[PDB]
Design a protein around this ligand. Structure first.
Ligand SMILES: [Mg+2]
Ligand SMILES: [Mg+2]
Ligand SMILES: [Mg+2]
Ligand SMILES: [Mg+2]
Ligand SMILES: [Mg+2]
Ligand SMILES: [Mg+2]
Ligand SMILES: [Mg+2]
Ligand SMILES: [Mg+2]
Ligand SMILES: [Mg+2]
Ligand SMILES: [Mg+2]
Ligand SMILES: [Mg+2]
Ligand SMILES: [Mg+2]
Ligand SMILES: [Mg+2]
Ligand SMILES: [Mg+2]
Ligand SMILES: [Mg+2]
Ligand SMILES: [Mg+2]
Ligand SMILES: [Mg+2]
Ligand SMILES: [Mg+2]
Ligand SMILES: [Mg+2]
Ligand SMILES: [Mg+2]
Ligand SMILES: [Mg+2]
Ligand SMILES: [Mg+2]
Ligand SMILES: [Mg+2]
Ligand SMILES: [Mg+2]
Ligand SMILES: [Mg+2]
Ligand SMILES: [Mg+2]
Ligand SMILES: [Mg+2]
Ligand SMILES: [Mg+2]
Ligand SMILES: [Mg+2]
Ligand SMILES: [Mg+2]
Ligand SMILES: [Mg+2]
Ligand SMILES: [Mg+2]
Ligand SMILES: [Mg+2]
Ligand SMILES: [Mg+2]
Ligand SMILES: [Mg+2]
Ligand SMILES: [Mg+2]
Ligand SMILES: [Mg+2]
Ligand SMILES: [Mg+2]
Ligand SMILES: [Mg+2]
Ligand SMILES: [Mg+2]
Ligand SMILES: [Mg+2]
Ligand SMILES: [Mg+2]
Ligand SMILES: [Mg+2]
Ligand SMILES: [Mg+2]
Ligand SMILES: [Mg+2]
Ligand SMILES: [Mg+2]
Ligand SMILES: [Mg+2]
Ligand SMILES: [Mg+2]
Ligand SMILES: [Mg+2]
Ligand SMILES: [Mg+2]
Ligand SMILES: [Mg+2]
Ligand SMILES: [Mg+2]
Ligand SMILES: [Mg+2]
Ligand SMILES: [Mg+2]
Ligand SMILES: [Mg+2]
Ligand SMILES: [Mg+2]
Ligand SMILES: [Mg+2]
Ligand SMILES: [Mg+2]
Ligand SMILES: [Mg+2]
Ligand SMILES: [Mg+2]
Ligand SMILES: [Mg+2]
Ligand SMILES: [Mg+2]
Ligand SMILES: [Mg+2]
Ligand SMILES: [Mg+2]
Ligand SMILES: [Mg+2]
Ligand SMILES: [Mg+2]
Ligand SMILES: [Mg+2]
Ligand SMILES: [Mg+2]
Ligand SMILES: [Mg+2]
Ligand SMILES: [Mg+2]
Ligand SMILES: [Mg+2]
Ligand SMILES: [Mg+2]
Ligand SMILES: [Mg+2]
Ligand SMILES: [Mg+2]
Length: 245
RNA sequence: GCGCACCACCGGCCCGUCUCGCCCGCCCCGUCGGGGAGGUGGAGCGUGAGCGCGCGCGAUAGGACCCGAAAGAUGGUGAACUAUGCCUGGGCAGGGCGAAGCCAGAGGAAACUCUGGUGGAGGUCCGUAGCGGUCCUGACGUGCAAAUCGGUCGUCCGACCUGGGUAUAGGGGCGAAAGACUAAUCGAACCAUCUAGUAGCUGGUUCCCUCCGAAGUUUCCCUCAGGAUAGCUGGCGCUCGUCCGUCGCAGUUUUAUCCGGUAAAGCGAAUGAUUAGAGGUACCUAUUCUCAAACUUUAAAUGGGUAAGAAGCCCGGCUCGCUGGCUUGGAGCCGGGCGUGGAAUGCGAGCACGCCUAGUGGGCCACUUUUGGUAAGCAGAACUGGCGCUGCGGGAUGAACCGAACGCCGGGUUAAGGCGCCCGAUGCCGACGCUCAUCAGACCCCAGAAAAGGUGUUGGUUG
RNA sequence: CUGAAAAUGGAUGGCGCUGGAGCGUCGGGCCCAUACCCGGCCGUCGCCGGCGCUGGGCUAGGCCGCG
RNA sequence: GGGCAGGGCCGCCCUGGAAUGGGUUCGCCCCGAGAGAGGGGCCCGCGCCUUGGAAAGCGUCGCGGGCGGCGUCCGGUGAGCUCUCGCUGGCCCUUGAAAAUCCGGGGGAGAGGGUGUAAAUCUCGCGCCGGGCCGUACCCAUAUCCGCAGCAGGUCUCCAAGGUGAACAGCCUCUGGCAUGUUAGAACAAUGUAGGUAAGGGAAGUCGGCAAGUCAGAUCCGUAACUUCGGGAUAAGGAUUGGCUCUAAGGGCUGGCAGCUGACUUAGAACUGGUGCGGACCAGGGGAAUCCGACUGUUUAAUUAAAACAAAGCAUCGCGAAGGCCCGAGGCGGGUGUUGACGCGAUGUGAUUUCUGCCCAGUGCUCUGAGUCAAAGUGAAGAAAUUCAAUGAAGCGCGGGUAAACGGCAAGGUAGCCAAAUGCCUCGUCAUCUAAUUAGUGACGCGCAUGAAUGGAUGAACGAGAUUCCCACUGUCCCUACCUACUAUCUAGCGAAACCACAGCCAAGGGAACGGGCUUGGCGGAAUCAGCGGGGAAAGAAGACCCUGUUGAGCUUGACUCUAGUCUGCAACUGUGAAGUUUCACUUACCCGGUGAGGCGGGGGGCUUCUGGACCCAAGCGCCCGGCGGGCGCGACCCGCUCCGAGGACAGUGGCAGGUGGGGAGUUUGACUGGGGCGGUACACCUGUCAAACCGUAACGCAGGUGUCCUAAGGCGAGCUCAGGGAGGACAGAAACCUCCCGUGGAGCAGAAGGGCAAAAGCUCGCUUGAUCUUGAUUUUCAGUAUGAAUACAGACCGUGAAAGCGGGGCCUCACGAUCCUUCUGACUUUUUGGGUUUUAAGCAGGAGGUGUCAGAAAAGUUACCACAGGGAUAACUGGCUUGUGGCGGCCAAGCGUUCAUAGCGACGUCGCUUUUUGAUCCUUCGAUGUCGGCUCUUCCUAUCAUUGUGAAGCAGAAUUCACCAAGCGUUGGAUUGUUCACCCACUAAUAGGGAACGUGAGCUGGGUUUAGACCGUCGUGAGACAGGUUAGUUUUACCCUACUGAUGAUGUGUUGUCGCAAUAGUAAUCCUGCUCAGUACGAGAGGAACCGCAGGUUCAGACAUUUGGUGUAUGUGCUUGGCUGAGGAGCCAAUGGGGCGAAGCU
């Protein structure tokens, strides 16, 4: 049989991301001497909408600590910030919404976003609209902080991972029911070519493991193993359990 | 009498192997090497016949008599059609209902309600362009057109329509998913090559004449549309014979002697089935009715085997390690003597009916016999003939029936079948009867009749 | 003769036949098959075939004879 | 270019200060963060004027590339139409490009001259010079492009007049364009294609209201059930509509009410007419329900627009980046990812509302720590190869969880729902719907085989979806007719194609079982025209259906054998150190992240949180060099080995090993067979029979057996005699044991059967291992090969008996297996390759391990998405043989008929016929005979329902029954169903039965069936299947030959014409009612005829148009809409403008 739809996405021909009108990569500043030994004053110049993501992006401007240059960054806009606000980045910056602080220099239970997964990755965790990470506890011996991710998992990261205090703006976006199919079309028309999802039971056996039969049954158990080959790994991949929770 | 070649048979020898064994040899005396006797395995020996060349045929492997697949593989070319994403442009009358927001006037004790207007929302409605393509299953249907035309119809601010520029390439692409679409090609494109792919399967296979002439059956086969094998065929011969005579031969009789368990018969005989009384005391005896394919005491017809001499008979001896009371057997061998060849008839035989060998291995039909089946122009056997391979006369006609089989002709005579005319032959003064039919009847196979009836007519029988 | 009814118009073969061209029993005569008899020609096959002993003859791989 | 209108600054300026808040728009909006007002400023000014500039251009009048005259003017309006510039708002889980290029500002390093200039000057204003290369024609589409073409197809745009009207609708005209689309003339037949009308009835047509028609615009009214409150809705149902003549209402400007001036509409009224008025054009039929899908959207280009897909919603699953998912031959590869759980990826269900039950056994997924377990490694034995042992990963196994996982209902179908798109029986039962209903709806539910995200139930709105009814409408129909246009037709010119063995009149017979040719008959007359669709089993295509092939392909799995990927283990890359094979540490390989690798580590010295500003290119000091300039240091600490961090000898890499692996690859999926499959094994064997007296002899013939059993049930000897019966004998009996007698085997002999068998072959007993070691020959199946199983010897060694003898398995006939490979035994001058020794390996010989498809491949499906080679060797459709079955008819006479066998019947039996049932068969056809029904239409049969003429009765009349001559004539209209077949409603003289390739598809219709789409049920793990249901699904060609229908003509008697004859062929009328006979005959009554006669009708036939109706393009005459001809008048155009009436003709 021919390859399944799930296999053609890794080729990257028509399933690539629509990144034409995107305003840039949202990431923190480069970790320098100003943020490891003090703070640097920024200024929010504009809060823009990035096509593809439901969270706004802030165009924060900084001064280059070594050249007469205006460094403009693109952060994930925390909810509550506005244009004209002075945000600060570093370990000696105060605990305010929008400031970029290490996760080790903050009290427990601090709500932060855009958390660096590794020290200096310029922010990876909790960057979607309406999400945040909570600093659970610290460990001054190993210099490791334990953070609670939006998925409920508690990850032990380094205490030097910077993060933006607050919650990512654009929260409550999923609380609105998309009423039309056209609204869902425009939602993914900027993301990628994946919205109209034909059921595997509606296809033919050549195109999908679940296709075929005089009826549209699945036939085989929908719970597939983890080590299934590409082309058979459909349905519920490595499902620990099934049924209504 | 010497006997060629050849053949039957019996010795003999070589190698393997087996059984039983008592001798022998030596410088390299040993777990040494040799030989005997009797069976047996071998593509042996037994005073070579091969080799080279050419011709022909046969079975093969090669494109392999020619043409033909659905496929498979390697490499490559296509997104000018179309499917989808992206980029950059273009385009989308006139009307209907009329959402939030707003204004005003009212009602009310208050909360709050009501009315008018305004506003112009929406995968809204009618609908043009556009894009689609419902129904007529209309037109056309060797068309205008390898998908079009007309009316009608869907939608027409949206998941809308479209050009251009780009992206994805064949077991891949893409797919709001029809196995759709990917250049009139898609349940795996196109191009060239591998490739003259293979085919137990269809089709075809080119001059004349002479002579001979089949098989659809046996066994085996992942066989049953096919092969292998045996049979049937042809060719090539060869060994002899070829007046009587003698060898030899036979789809035949005769004589002699065996074999069988079918028809018929039997069950008052066995086994099995079965009817009715009778006698003696439900049985028991003697009877009685009806039967067998997997019953039988009996038992044919047809049919099968053998024999009908010289490879014999007769007389006299020899060999043996087998046999043994004893030449006692048995078999072999030797010498001599004896054709009236030791049934009829016909006939040339032999070489494992030699050597090579094509075709065939779908059969079919009839008398009789016979199985399944209500039956069948049904299915399945035995035997013989026939058709197929075969024309001819006759049955009007027709692969099989009847007669008879075939070079080219003349005369004659017939077969089966015919002789009113078609149509050769009764254009006999044929014989004897039978029969009237308002559906008469008119002859193998054979191509429509039954049970039951008639005071039609003609015979006969018993009263 | 009754019993005896199928669909295009039709099949002793047809015409037709009733002192028979019907049925049964027979007689004489007659008709013709590539069958049988005799004869011619052609070929094949078989002759323990014939001829080297010449008007003709014997290209013997020829000629001739017989069935 | 300049100037000025005009427009915009709710985005600017100054004054000032607001509530009695004001300003203001179509809408909004605006203001103490400052309104209103006044006065300014800026941007855009494509407008006007003007330089250009009228000299040119144009119109017109002249005159001779030109000369001239004159004119080119003054105005006024707008929801007008396009274009453009602004203002302002709405919508997005949609935020709707980059770069070249150009400009402004911040900063002030520097530059410039020392008293008139210098630096400098943004086209400031002018002057001077240069601007290369390529493309440029024309078509741009009913003839310049593509589709083989001058092809009714296709192919991206730009500009857009008047009238009507809401309109870029339709219709008419102007500018512009064209010649009717690759020909013309004549005629006006059939049949067509397109358009239209039709009286009376109104779906009776048909599978089905298919097609057609009705409705339609606007205005004023009136608008239910239901609902998600949005809708339904143009619901439905009504009225009005012309022309003309008026009235009233809705503005602006100027002057302070007056004057002037509109241009677009509404409302009311009068008059008027052949009641006609959205007059043409344009332009929804409606309602009551069921089924499915929520909707909009999308889909098989070229047969399926759907109930399919999608969809929002719902739910589940994976994953925190060293990741999930996926690509990839390969890398520090690539996609999602410019991403980060409100994310991405994988599925299921399918809006809302309402619920979503039970089962974790099976399969699958997932989660745990106590038998199996590879390579490597360790240990042991051995000369070594080798062998053995221990250890022993993942995975499996064990255990838990999981069903909005597959599924089922280990659990036994809960809530619901239903004879449903799902119910076999079935046309279920009941009610309703109709005169009549296999349909529809509402109910009933042990439901063949409903059922809950394999989703159950409901449901407004919506639908080119399926279905039922009603209203309205209509030529769908009763029942056809007429008119118009283009064809056909004829002529001029032009001019193909399919097809074709030869060809073309039939009946019957036979035949390859449906001839055109042969046979026997009928008979047959040139050359042709227009038609026609009976025939040529017509053409079109080496049947796609069925089967075969040791031919494939698509797809699927619990098929065979592999594989990418993935998991896991070992050593290598792989270093350092500590502690008890593990853990904590080290960095240095390796790995990841960040950055323009910008401040690291160790010492010394001593700094930014109020604001949408600004921030660099050292001030200062110290030192030094030049003739007013320049340089250096400090300012800004020193030193240093990895840029800084996160990992780290683990990830990872390469190489082996195990697991997993339809993701993928290759292949396979026996044969026989009254088609095939299913079943069976008739596939290797045995007995009886078939089998026809040797042997042999077939079928999916008949009745059975076999894949064993036996240390004796083998071998030998000896003794003994069985089954059963009679008579007896304590318990003891119909059967216990003892005795006698009879007992041809009637018992037994392992088994199926047959044969054989009595001091045997049976039974019992005691000695045994001839069931041993060998060679060859022979028999049977046979090819006379093998195997299997047998026969008779011989040579050994034994058993047994006193011995003769008997015995190398079973009393005989069945009870079994090649090569290769493995294993065992035995033997020897056997090999182990230059010799020797010992291991090992090989060989010889004999057994065993097994191929049951049994002379011996290694083997699951599915295909309707299918393909090829073929096959009438072989199925489904006709015909042919057969007639079991079906239908029909005799014979015999038990009996029925109150009595009486035969008026009418006919049991038990029995004989036939028919080919309108079905079956059987497989002869014809698979290089194709279109296949069900209906419609249409003709002819035929009689086994007569009715009519005609009769006979019979359990015939009084009437009605009816039976039978005869008899097929001339007729056998109907409807509901339901695709249906033939049934059933019912009526009508009728009767509503008889059949054939003709189950007549009739180049006649039709596609309803059924019968491709591909899709749903449901059952079934299968699955792909799929289902003669179960349901929905949508291309019906091609005649001009050829005959046949038939008509039309010319041909025929020979001289030509020609009129008037006739006539063979032969066709043939046609039919049934009924009323009245009278007649309330008569007959009968007790009730009832109730018949002949003649009479008046009409039904069906059919041939005509015909006086009349009535219909058509009507005499385009005849009126009316009228839109437009046009300046108006009237007269007319035209709108593919027949529409409508009224209408001659002739046809009907
Ligand atoms: Mg599908
Ligand atoms: Mg499936
Ligand atoms: Mg299932
Ligand atoms: Mg292959
Ligand atoms: Mg509507
Ligand atoms: Mg349209
Ligand atoms: Mg169309
Ligand atoms: Mg059509
Ligand atoms: Mg046509
Ligand atoms: Mg519509
Ligand atoms: Mg494009
Ligand atoms: Mg390739
Ligand atoms: Mg399909
Ligand atoms: Mg001959
Ligand atoms: Mg034969
Ligand atoms: Mg053949
Ligand atoms: Mg042969
Ligand atoms: Mg052969
Ligand atoms: Mg054959
Ligand atoms: Mg037969
Ligand atoms: Mg047969
Ligand atoms: Mg033959
Ligand atoms: Mg012969
Ligand atoms: Mg005959
Ligand atoms: Mg003669
Ligand atoms: Mg004759
Ligand atoms: Mg009688
Ligand atoms: Mg008769
Ligand atoms: Mg002669
Ligand atoms: Mg400056
Ligand atoms: Mg210049
Ligand atoms: Mg041009
Ligand atoms: Mg043209
Ligand atoms: Mg024209
Ligand atoms: Mg009418
Ligand atoms: Mg009807
Ligand atoms: Mg219609
Ligand atoms: Mg309604
Ligand atoms: Mg319902
Ligand atoms: Mg829909
Ligand atoms: Mg289509
Ligand atoms: Mg699910
Ligand atoms: Mg489980
Ligand atoms: Mg229930
Ligand atoms: Mg109805
Ligand atoms: Mg119902
Ligand atoms: Mg459930
Ligand atoms: Mg629709
Ligand atoms: Mg013919
Ligand atoms: Mg045909
Ligand atoms: Mg074929
Ligand atoms: Mg085969
Ligand atoms: Mg395929
Ligand atoms: Mg496969
Ligand atoms: Mg295959
Ligand atoms: Mg088979
Ligand atoms: Mg016999
Ligand atoms: Mg012996
Ligand atoms: Mg056949
Ligand atoms: Mg019968
Ligand atoms: Mg009877
Ligand atoms: Mg009759
Ligand atoms: Mg009808
Ligand atoms: Mg038919
Ligand atoms: Mg026909
Ligand atoms: Mg047709
Ligand atoms: Mg038909
Ligand atoms: Mg249909
Ligand atoms: Mg279908
Ligand atoms: Mg009376
Ligand atoms: Mg007018
Ligand atoms: Mg027009
Ligand atoms: Mg018109
Ligand atoms: Mg009229």
């Amino acid at each position: 049989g021919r390859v399944i739809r799930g296999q053609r996405k890794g080729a990257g021909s028509v399933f690539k991301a629509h990144v034409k009108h995107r305003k840039g990569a949202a990431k923190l500043r480069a970790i320098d001497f100003a943020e490891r030994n003090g703070y640097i004053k920024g200024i929010v110049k504009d809060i823009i909408h990035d096509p593809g993501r439901g969270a706004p992006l802030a165009k924060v401007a900084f001064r280059d600590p070594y050249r007469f240059k205006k460094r403009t960054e693109l952060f994930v806009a925390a909810e509550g910030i506005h244009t004209g606000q002075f945000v600060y980045c570093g370990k000696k910056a105060q605990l305010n919404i929008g400031n970029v602080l290490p996760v080790g220099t903050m009290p427990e239970g601090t709500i932060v976003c855009c958390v660096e997964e590794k020290p200096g990755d310029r922010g990876k965790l909790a960057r979607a609209s309406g999400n945040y990470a909570t600093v659970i506890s610290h460990n001054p011996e190993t210099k490791k902080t334990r953070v609670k991710l939006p998925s409920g998992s508690k990850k032990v990261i380094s205490s030097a991972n910077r993060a933006i205090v607050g919650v990512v703006a654009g929260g409550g976006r999923i609380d609105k029911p998309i009423l039309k199919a056209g609204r869902a079309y425009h939602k993914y028309k900027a993301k990628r070519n994946c919205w109209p999802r034909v059921r595997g039971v509606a296809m033919n056996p050549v195109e999908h493991p679940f296709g075929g039969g005089n009826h549209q049954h699945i036939g085989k158990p929908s719970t597939i193993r983890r080590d299934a080959p590409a082309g058979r790994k459909v349905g519920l991949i490595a499902a620990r359990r099934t049924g209504r929770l």
